[PDB]
Swiss-Prot record, chains A, B, C:
Keyword Calcium: yes
Recorded name of the encoding gene: mdlC
Source species: Pseudomonas putida
InterPro entries for the chain: DHS-like_NAD/FAD-binding_dom, THDP-binding, Thiamin_PyroP_enz_cen_dom, Thiamin_PyroP_enz_TPP-bd_dom, TPP-bd_CS, TPP_enz, TPP_enzyme_TPP-bd
Residue intervals passing through the bilayer: none
Keywords linked to the UniProt accession: Aromatic hydrocarbons catabolism, Calcium, Decarboxylase, Lyase, Magnesium, Mandelate pathway, Metal-binding, Thiamine pyrophosphate
Protein name per the record: Benzoylformate decarboxylase
Taxonomic lineage from the root: Bacteria, Pseudomonadati, Pseudomonadota, Gammaproteobacteria, Pseudomonadales
Length: 525, 525, 525
């Protein structure tokens, strides 16, 4: 067998059937004779390739495989890798290297010091020392991406390796099963259960690893049992709980003092599947107030180590949420009461308030819609205004790196063909990965893109206000016609300048058989 | 003085007056109170920011200053840094970091292990240990980028540092002059001159550091004196010699055997300002044939170390080319005869052959035009067909990373307002950095973009043919309307489906007062 | 030819004839069939191997070649590499790797992520992608170590590579000559000469790269011409000037304020071959006082970039010192007057004052002795008390890393068989690399080791006093019998408890035919 044939066998035997890629010359020997049972999803720039693969991996809850061109292709993807690191996305990134006989002279397209290029944004990064090692290296990459805490990995392969003979002993790689599905030992889990059972006023805080594990339903049972309010940890990349369940409290503000104040009076705070905490703004104060103690369940030792407070347990979120939900007592306390519905903001016949856009989406979208957010100034309103009943219903760039949602929404729609994906993306953010639109057109992946056009980088105007910063350049982005960009890449395009046109455009998009972009004129901040 | 005021003083005193940027929240404290004598050039994605700055630095022959947002912004620019490394471009890349009080908890937008992110594509990468160190660190970055061999550098600055008090001793940084303008000592330079004077059949090979040094005219005098043919080193990122001078031979093929065969019978080959050599294709054979010896003058120790043959001298290209051109004897041999003009390829009334496009550009463009190439399958024809008399007339992505020429052509046009820039870019390559078009529209930088539309990644079809590789996916890019993309970003757009329309479109673009994009329908390979 | 035969041919053709090593199993395929024209110098621990090679390279002014065992052997040498980085020592460090078929599984003795292990203490670090690349990689290592600014390099080689067939084109590597012997261009050098000629009160400051370049005599001519006082830059690893020449001023204190005060009233300060400056203690103040400007000539861009003041020129120290010494005018000012001799410290019939030891060494050692210092509390007195007329007469660990002088003194003595080496080493410092003594015994390298025994880490007691730090543990080192350690490793040993015994012991050591260790009882601080 060749290294090529052994490698595609390993991939298929490990459940991989799709290559997300932008091809180049060092990759043609890998991509030739492409197997008939695989599919190749082309995107036109590598931030788009990786973002599509990342949405697909997060929604499918399985690793996604990427092929990029040498150093420049890998480099164009590194902002996308920053988000994938923070979302624990299981991405297997491969890149082609020059032929081994050409690496010493540093021929054009040599990836110099290749394994160092994507650091520190990968769990494992490697270039094999010989051709016959490639299948074993690929096996290491698959399992490094897939074991808890999941995350991106990188493998560089000289182009001459693929046609060499494989080691016949590589067959032992094909069916390896590697598990990190673990939970706290019995004795210590009993101590934790008794602490939860004994709390007088527990609170629960959930992060994105809950949605990744599909632990959402177990966390609903846990919160119902403990009769406890549930918040989503700050800077949330996913939604871990039904947002109209009576226990739901919403998204935590990303500030130290704000969070300790919110938790004041709760004696035990159980955090599951989140860093403690992904703060953002400067908001100094106490980490926790007197009388509150915190216990964190995390799948990531790096999260456990850096929490400034609380106890921690490093374990699989699926296994721990299931065990806690089935072991805790049913408290006799009253179930929390549901938050009230948000109010309708006054809306005239002109430009749209963001609040109106989300209320209208909530009114018209199917109950199993999946939303993506890259409308940076409107996140609080989006979290209040969209009823997300089901798992896998929300994604937001986990490292704050713009250029995620447009491509990721195409990958999510590919992963979930029966759930309507609706990406709500600011006019600024839409540009970072605009060419991803072409992949939705070419493959007919029916994502709906809602572009919130207010002419400016609104969140930066907000942060500049907080800092009291004057005379900052570069904050305005006038003069972009999103209908024309959609036409450029083959996507049907609509414009909504008022509420009547928003409703009409959404009814048309929801009825369409392909991807649709709607440019919405929103109010300037 | 604050760190902010001291830093902008250092920049202005070191000749920096322009910030190329895409802003973010960790950078607002740097960008506030932006000085009235500086300009800020916004681009919508960071590969575009860096590419614009890189074209500006290469054409201006001085460092360019960039400001990006944390890890994700820096990561989105890393393919652009791969080209800047290979072109020795003096780029000062700064990125904002979280406030120092928030870095430990890894708050959102913390750039983790920041100085390692852009490695190995930078000469120096650093985050200061305190606020007061920032001006000194910035001074180190300026000089590291600017000293031979020039190249990109990286500095990460916590956002809280800018408002702190500066060290009053920082004033000693402002007027430092650092020189690497050096040449080989007298005794050894005399030995080299005598070897050149004594050669029976010398050849000269020039690389991009000649154009960077503006050593082109000195190299013409040197070649006239020695009566020697002149080639451009393979994979050429710049043009170092007038392409219709009688000594000019053209671009070397990027193969080991091809180059030794070309040099056969030349007793001494003097390479100036190039790696030895930036080969690309697999073309095994002899590095040099019997009877040829090679001497390399390079500004980069890494180039001298990795050459597989020849002697080398590590020195400034400007100083060495000037000294050699003024010291060598006038040989009594006959001056080489000029290459003949290329032939006209037969052209019907349909889609354009690339050869027709370059002949027409050559006929109609001003004699001081500047060209950019990212039409990967047509490079040989472009080098034969365009008469480039002047320095600074050609750029091509030095690491082969697509997404360079569209933004770089805007930076070059900003650097050279009186020279018409014409970027010739394939339909595939045009997508990587398509949003750069918006910066040309917003600032009215009158670059002309010629998009060669043949529907496919043509160079990859070529390389697949060489490899005899069948069933490769992802090679076609149908369905892109470049006129609509230009409209999307505010650039006037024309289409040329035949030669009559090409001539008309070029006459209109050449007469226009702003940037123009022409979509040219070219023949499919 | 095999890779083994081609590599030893490359080494011999590049002037390498000695391997400093501690062998291991991954290195046996390199070391077998060891060529009869090479010598192998064994040391018992890798800090000793590297220190011996470093003294040999610094004294011979040529690269030295080292072979170490995998990761653990390389790791044991990393404190020695820290000194070699700071002294710009041209060291070629090679380490054996597992066979390529065993690297993936991480067999015992695999050097994981090998090229990253010695960073940041090396100029270049690499593992080749195939066996046939090894000779080319070795060529890169030789030239990277040898080009200005010289320094250590690292190459890792899988053990199976040595018996593979070499590429016949590797012969082009054997005779490559690479030069960095460069100086500032004529026009700018004339500007610098005119500034020196015009100065009213110039001062000269010299660093270790002057001694490395053997530029000492040219710097004496330069100082005589300019009639200028000469200081040695602080934290001096070498001696660049005759210490009883009338212009000599001594070692600069390593403090910011102390140095600006020393230079006050000097209008132009020319620094050659030093960082600006290797300060140590906290001594805040002005970098330079009003009226003094500084010009630095350095072979190291990293030094030029980080100087907090002055202009800089990056060039070869030998070439620049020769050009300046031959171009400057003979000033009509009076030649500086020689510093007076140091005073005799009162000495009773008991334990020795360090001052007495250095005066006695100066009285009895030959005029061409070479000294090494690792007696950390006595450096100021050593620099006042030893007349060092000749180049290559002093070495002190350039990064402050103890364990350098004992092994380095053996390498220096091997490099300079006709110059008596005398290492003056504190009782604390002597332990770090004590096993190096065995190499002096086995090869009969007649270094004299003078151990200053005061029972304590004296310099740390001093620094603790400056900090006013009380209750610091670990400062005393009682209970070491250095005569017994010397016996353990086969070196003749003497003890001196008073001045009479010091004189007798030195007369015996100076007359001996092999290495001698003298334990001197010195006064406690
Ligand atoms: C790759 C990249 N580059 C730049 C930034 C900086 N940045 C951003 C940030 O630095 C801050 C992000 C942040 C921080 C906390 C919470 N949410 C977001 S936001 C932004 C403007 C986006 O504008 P738009 O999409 O039109 O939406 P709004 O008008 O609703 O705000 C920018 C530019 C970024 N986050 N990522
Ligand atoms: C960031 C990035 N991603 C991918 C590649 C791979 N690649 C390329 C390469 O891997 C090879 C590049 C090369 C190698 C030697 C010389 N010149 C170029 S070329 C290419 C197609 C570009 O298509 P287009 O612009 O339409 O022009 P042609 O039709 O005339 O060819 C691609 C996609 C690349 N070079 N850079
Ligand atoms: C590898 C290593 N480990 C530890 C140190 C720390 N250190 C040292 C340092 O941290 C400081 C070094 C310094 C700083 C400036 C100038 N000169 C030296 S000195 C020292 C004691 C050495 O004792 P000894 O040899 O008996 O001489 P003295 O009695 O005359 O002082 C020690 C231990 C060190 N420098 N290097
Ligand atoms: Mg906006
Ligand atoms: Mg094309
Ligand atoms: Mg001591």
């Amino acid at each position: 067998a060749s290294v090529h044939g052994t490698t595609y066998e390993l991939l298929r035997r490990q459940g991989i059937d799709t290559v997300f890629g932008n091809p180049g010359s060092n990759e043609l020997p890998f991509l030739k004779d492409f197997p008939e049972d695989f599919r190749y999803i082309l995107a036109l720039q590598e931030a788009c390739v990786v973002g599509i693969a990342d949405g697909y991996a997060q929604a499918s809850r399985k690793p996604a495989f990427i092929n990029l061109h040498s150093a420049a292709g890998t480099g164009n993807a590194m902002g996308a890798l920053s988000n994938a690191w923070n979302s624990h996305s299981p991405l297997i990134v491969t890149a082609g290297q020059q032929t081994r006989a050409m690496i010493g002279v540093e021929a054009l397209l040599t990836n110099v010091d290749a394994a160092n290029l994507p650091r520190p944004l990968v769990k494992w990064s490697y270039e094999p020392a010989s051709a016959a090692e490639v299948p074993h290296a690929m096996s290491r990459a698959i399992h490094m991406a897939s074991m808890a805490p999941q995350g991106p990995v990188y493998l560089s392969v000289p182009y001459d390796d693929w046609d060499k003979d494989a080691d016949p002993q590589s067959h032992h790689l094909f069916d390896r099963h590697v598990s990190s599905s673990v939970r706290l030992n019995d004795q210590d889990l009993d101590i934790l259960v008794k602490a939860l059972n004994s709390a007088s006023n527990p609170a629960i805080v959930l992060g994105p690893d809950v949605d990744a594990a599909n632990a959402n339903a177990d966390c609903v049972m846990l919160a119902e049992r403990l009769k406890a309010p549930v918040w989503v940890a700050p800077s949330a990349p996913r939604c871990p709980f039904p947002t109209r369940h009576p226990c739901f409290r919403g998204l935590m503000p990303a500030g130290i003092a704000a969070i300790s104040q919110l938790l004041e009076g709760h004696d035990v705070v159980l955090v599951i599947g989140a860093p403690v905490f992904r703060y953002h703004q400067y908001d100094p104060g106490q980490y926790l107030k007197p009388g509150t103690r915190l216990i964190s369940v995390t799948c990531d030792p790096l999260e456990a180590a850096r929490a400034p407070m609380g106890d921690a347990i490093v374990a699989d979120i699926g296994a721990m949420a299931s065990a806690l939900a089935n072991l805790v007592e049913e408290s006799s306390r009253q179930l929390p009461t549901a938050a009230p519905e948000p109010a309708k903001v006054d809306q005239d016949a002109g430009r749209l308030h963001p609040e109106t856009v989300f209320d209208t989406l909530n009114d018209m979208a199917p109950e199993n819609a999946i939303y993506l957010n890259e409308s940076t100034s409107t996140t609080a309103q989006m979290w209040q205004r969209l009823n997300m009943r089901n798992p896998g219903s929300y994604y937001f760039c986990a490292a704050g790196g713009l250029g995620f949602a447009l491509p990721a929404a195409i990958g999510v729609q590919l992963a979930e063909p029966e759930r309507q994906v609706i990406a709500v993306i600011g006019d600024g953010s839409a540009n970072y990965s605009i060419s991803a639109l072409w992949t939705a057109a070419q493959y007919n992946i029916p994502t709906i893109f809602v572009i919130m056009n207010n002419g400016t980088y609104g969140a930066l105007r907000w942060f500049a206000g907080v800092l009291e910063a004057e005379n900052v350049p570069g904050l305005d982005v006038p003069g972009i016609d999103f209908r024309a960009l959609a036409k450029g890449y083959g996507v049907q395009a609509l414009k909504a300048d008022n509420l009547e046109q928003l409703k009409g455009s959404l009814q048309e998009a929801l009825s369409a058989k392909g991807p649709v972009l709607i440019e919405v004129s929103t109010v300037s901040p």
